[PDB]
Amino acid sequence: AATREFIEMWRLLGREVPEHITEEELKTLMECVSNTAKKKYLKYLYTKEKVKKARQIKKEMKAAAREEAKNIKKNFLFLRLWDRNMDIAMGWKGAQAMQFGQPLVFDMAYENYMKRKELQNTVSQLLESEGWNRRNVDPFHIYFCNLKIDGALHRELVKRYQEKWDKLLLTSTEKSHVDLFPKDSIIYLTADSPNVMTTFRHDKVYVIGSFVDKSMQPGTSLAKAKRLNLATECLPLDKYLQWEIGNKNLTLDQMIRILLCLKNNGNWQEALQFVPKRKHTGFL
């Protein structure tokens, strides 16, 4: 590719540019069809190396630090096998959740509204969100609805989980949540809903739209809910928090941690602990 015609002086020009690039990275560079977009991507691609080597340099510096102390310097009940035992324990709990647990739906029908940066970030929040469900005392039955098998979102999920994808204790499906559940019990959670969520209802299916629009697109989740006949609710952030800073649309890992706290009889004081403290000045 001739796209090297930009990089090979942009390094000499004085802008921050990474030294190691591949054709796969080079391909995504040419979709950036403006000077600022290319500069923004190159800045991201440059800082990837910057924290890599800095953390790289840290780790073998530690290797010398421990190898000198490790080489120079009884009755037990259990073998030290806890990480294996914890994973098995969460597996049994997840298997029980898939049968009797309350369903929670992550709507994957937002692939067409996301750029590559946003789509990748959605998976990262999805990975953390499902991780917190596993470690909970009373896990949800997590559903991935509207997830196209060949779609971009599915391929990214497979790449991140690798072998674990086929072994996850969650129900991923092509069908919409309206096909799996009665339309009366579905409550599409969205920040733009005019109805404020008062109490957590254990006989309802809460739908979270897996949409991370860093280029914020208000009303997208509400439009989907009103395109169907689904009811909507919004978190009582204004009721219990003194907001000052930032968007009121929380991340997927914060949302699931708020719902999990509510499901475990926690009040709104404990549940809203997971709203970033940088966005408000205390609970009232």
Binding site: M9, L12, L13, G14, D238
Partner: protein
């Protein structure tokens, strides 16, 4: 507090180390009769405005053209068509907190500023420094402005100021990549100051070879220049053509002019002597013309909203109506037309607004309940019972403005036109840009309307209700001349103090009092003192010309010397208009059994405490006064910014109450139809209504807190 002055040192001493990167010239007023002629210059560090005409502030805010960053306002003539509406502009500048604004033009703005202080509050907080043409050259971080006074062959009414602007030289780009092969350390904080020398072009000794820096720097822009010149009429063509200063910029090849804006009518341009003048500038110089030949829309939102309401009822909401090859090529001015001067000289036509009605209707039906409600109302009214009481088509009430104080995209400041008969009319209030609303509402018929305008009433010395009065007078004189009718002074009923502003303007700025026959509002009251006989035959003219059986007035509860009104016709119908004021008992005694009542309804229900703080009423109090009026119908106007697009509908809204909009016609034969227009109304304004109910809720949370 504005970012413009707080981030001052970041801008740099000589700009950002030499010149601004981008500079274009945008037209906010293409020269139409209603909108006037105005020009806007954008730069990285400064923003300029030319010929701040009446209603220009409305156009600059509606087109997202920031006002809190303006530095100088250049006026080419000491004339109301060019200076009018500046009083509103300085109030807007004061609101934003801008400390200092510089005015330029004829030396008479010294007297103009002291003249407008009669009505406007002493502008505390904002510095107004008038810089006349006799002052030295004004140099800024971006550009240099040259002021040339031009005197016609015939205060001083023959003075015209023309501006020859000149952009400062911008330091060129630095060929940083080639400097490596020479040996320059591109690395940051490594012999960087050479770049400043590279910008300057001075030689620097590097790698044992002191080279002239322009070798490693792009050829710097010498700085394109543009000229702002206005030729009001024929008597200014000759002095402009023979102006010595202009020869220094057109005949020379070292100082080209990129663009020349021409604020002159069509008749001036076709003149042969003026024709030779543009070609003398050179074939390179583009020419822009702003005059009445422009055919474009400015108040797009007003046109947009008017078309949508026109679907509900065409008669009640009439549609707004818009009002020879040349040797030298020239480009007609259009709204938001741009001409970039740096780094490329080109005609940027992208931002020009388009006025396509079809979209505006299309937007209407896709609304949730608009199409159903309009259709439901149409069959109920057109194909239902008798269409109201059988009464005459006159009088008809024209609501040219329903704005509380500042103009807004949807509503202009208060101005109401009453058509007593087809051959006579009167103005109940004349706010800023009232003629613009008059011209937009009638189009080619504005001159006929001005010919039938017999009297003007002014409620209180508040500027929202009277600052547009001068603009009517010059247009009325032109309209009367076009119709051939003899020129006679207009009848104005207003408080005595209104003469103070007019006397100041007439003796210092421009002759306008010869069109004025002012009748003080004090002698119009009931049981009033017998005044001088000179006023006495004027009061007979008021009743005779306007066919009024009686014309009453009283002091309404507001700022001192504030007055209400009451029209009584020989036929019998009685129209009572109340300016800004809380429920007043004197008003109640005035218009008992009035046919129609127009009342101030500025605030919501639940804001009574600042309603008295601002001497202003709410909807329920205004409605309750209407019941105390025992009036057939009630009209609400003078809505505040909070009711930006639509008044909130209180449960007290009965069949005897109604809401007013801009360019909305109300006749006595439409009274029962007005309540029937409500169901369509929230249907179109549904997204807007939900904004009001929540912001009403937000204040409750503050009260609860």
């Amino acid at each position: 507090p504005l970012r413009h002055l707080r981030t001052r040192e970041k801008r740099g001493p000589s700009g950002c180390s030499g010149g601004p990167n981008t500079v274009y010239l945008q037209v906010v007023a293409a020269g139409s009769r209603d909108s006037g002629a105005a020009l806007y210059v954008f730069s990285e560090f400064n923003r300029y405005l030319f010929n701040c005409g009446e209603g220009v502030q409305r156009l600059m805010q509606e087109h997202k053209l920031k006002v809190a960053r303006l530095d100088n306002i250049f006026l080419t003539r000491m004339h109301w068509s060019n200076v009018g509406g500046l009083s509103g502009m300085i109030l807007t500048l004061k609101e934003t907190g801008l400390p200092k604004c510089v005015l330029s033009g004829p030396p008479q703005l010294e007297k103009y500023l002291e003249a407008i202080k009669i009505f406007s509050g002493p502008l505390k907080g904002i510095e107004l420094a008038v810089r006349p043409h006799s002052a030295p050259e004004y140099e800024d971080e971006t550009m240099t402005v040259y002021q040339i006074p031009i005197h016609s062959e015939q205060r001083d009414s023959s003075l015209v100021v023309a501006f020859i602007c000149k952009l400062h030289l911008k330091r060129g780009n630095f060929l940083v990549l080639k400097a490596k092969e020479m040996g320059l350390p591109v690395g940051t904080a490594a012999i960087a100051p050479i770049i400043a020398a590279v910008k300057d072009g001075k030689s620097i000794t590097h790698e044992g070879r002191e080279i002239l820096a322009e070798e490693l720097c792009t050829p710097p822009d010498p700085g394109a220049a543009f000229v702002v010149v206005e030729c009001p009429d024929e008597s200014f063509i000759q002095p402009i053509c023979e102006n010595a200063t202009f020869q220094r910029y057109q005949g020379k090849a070292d100082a080209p002019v990129a663009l020349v804006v021409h604020m002159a009518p069509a008749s001036v341009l076709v003149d042969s002597r003026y024709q030779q003048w543009m070609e003398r500038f050179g074939p390179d110089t583009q020419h822009l013309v702003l005059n009445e030949n422009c055919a474009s829309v400015h108040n797009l939102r007003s046109h947009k909203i008017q078309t949508q309401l026109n679907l509900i009822h065409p008669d009640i909401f009439p549609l707004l109506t818009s009002f020879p090859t040349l040797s030298v090529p020239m480009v007609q001015g259009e709204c938001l037309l741009k001409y970039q001067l740096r780094p490329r000289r080109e005609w940027q036509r992208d931002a020009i607004i388009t006025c396509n009605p079809e979209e505006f209707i299309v937007e209407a039906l896709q609304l949730p309940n608009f199409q159903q409600s309009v259709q439901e109302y149409r069959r109920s009214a057109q194909d239902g019972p008798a269409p109201a009481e059988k009464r005459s088509q006159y009088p008809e009430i024209i609501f040219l403005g329903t704005g509380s104080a500042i103009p807004m995209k949807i509503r202009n400041v208060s101005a109401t036109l009453v058509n007593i008969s087809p051959d006579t009319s009167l103005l109940l209030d004349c706010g800023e840009g009232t003629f613009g609303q008059l011209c937009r509402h009638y189009g080619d018929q504005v001159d006929r309307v001005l010919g039938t305008l017999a009297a003007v009433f002014v409620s209180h010395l508040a500027a929202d209700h009277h600052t547009g009065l001068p603009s009517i007078l010059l247009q009325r004189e032109r309209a009367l001349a076009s119709l051939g009718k003899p020129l006679h002074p207009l009848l104005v009923v207003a408080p005595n103090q209104l003469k103070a502003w007019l006397q100041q303007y007439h003796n210092q700025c421009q002759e306008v009092l010869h069109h004025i026959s002012m009748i003080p509002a004090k002698c119009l009251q009931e049981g009033a003192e017998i005044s001088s006989p000179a006023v006495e035959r004027l009061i007979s003219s008021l009743l005779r010309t306007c066919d009024l059986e009686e014309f009453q007035t009283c002091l309404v509860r507001h700022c001192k010397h504030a007055f209400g009104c009451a029209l009584v016709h020989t036929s019998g119908w009685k129209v009572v208009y109340s300016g800004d004021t809380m429920p007043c008992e004197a008003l109640v005694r005035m218009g008992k059994d009035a046919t129609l009542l127009i009342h101030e309804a500025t605030l919501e229900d639940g804001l009574e405490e600042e309603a008295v703080e601002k001497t202003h009423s709410t909807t329920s109090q205004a409605i309750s006064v209407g019941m105390r009026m025992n009036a057939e119908f009630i009209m609400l106007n003078h809505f505040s910014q909070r009711y930006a697009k639509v008044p909130l509908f209180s449960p007290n809204f009965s069949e005897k109450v109604g809401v007013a909009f801009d360019h909305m016609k109300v006749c006595f034969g439409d009274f029962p139809t007005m309540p029937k227009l409500i169901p369509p109304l929230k249907a179109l304004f549904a997204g807007d209504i939900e904004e009001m109910e929540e912001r009403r809720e937000k204040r409750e949370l503050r009260q609860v807190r």
